[PDB]
Amino acid sequence: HMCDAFVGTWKLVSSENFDDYMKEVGVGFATRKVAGMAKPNMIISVNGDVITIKSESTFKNTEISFILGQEFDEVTADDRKVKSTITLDGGVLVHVQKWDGKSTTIKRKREDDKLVVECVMKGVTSTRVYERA
Ligand SMILES: [C][C][C][C][C][C]SC1=NC([O])=N([C]C2=[C]N=[C][C]=[C]2)C([S])=N1
Incomplete structure (x- = not known):
């Protein structure tokens, strides 16, 4: 029951500073644009x-x-x-x-x-908030 409160299907509801985070990581322009447009679901599961x-x-x-x-x-x-x-x-x-x-x-x-x-890369933090799907 390691991680039970994380398990499930989660949907992105808000983002802040993600483009700036990706810049700091070194992500190039075109990938930043299309990735920053993403509306991901995050699916977390545990097996043993x-x-x-x-x-x-x-x-x-x-x-x-x-x-x-x-x-x-x-x-x-x-x-x-x-x-x-x-x-x-x-x-x-x-x-x-x-x-x-x-x-x-x-x-x-x-x-x-x-x-x-x-998400932190040098001094830049991005906050990405998810809710249950
Ligand atoms: C750079 C990256 C891009 C992405 C694109 C697609 S959307 C998404 N995905 C994922 O996974 N996540 C988590 C992480 C990881 N890594 C890093 C950061 C974060 C999020 S929040 N969102």
């Missing part, structure tokens, strides 16, 4: 120790599966090849991506009836 997170939109359908604390290689929606580790820290799922000497952290937390995603 394996957590799966899917992001589905008209831009891309992506899926990762992982065990907490155990690094994996990921291809991101914007085609970076990154090394990822996801942990649960005080109720927050913390996802760190490392590539080309850079790092970004994506945090997922439950707040009221929302799932709030905070």
Whole structure:
């Protein structure tokens, strides 16, 4: 019952600073535009120790599966090849991506009836709020 409050199908309801976050990450113009237009559903499931997170939109359908604390290689929606580790820290799922000497952290937390995603790259934070579908 690790992560139960995260499990489910979630729909994006608001975004702030995502274009600026993607700029800082290095996402190019055309991908930023089409990805910033995405209205993703985030689908989170658990089977034993394996957590799966899917992001589905008209831009891309992506899926990762992982065990907490155990690094994996990921291809991101914007085609970076990154090394990822996801942990649960005080109720927050913390996802760190490392590539080309850079790092970004994506945090997922439950707040009221929302799932709030905070994406940080150097000084820039984007907040992406989801509700149950
Ligand atoms: C750069 C990226 C792009 C994307 C595109 C599509 S939409 C979406 N997806 C996803 O997954 N998410 C989570 C994350 C991850 N990573 C990073 C950040 C975040 C969100 S909130 N949204």
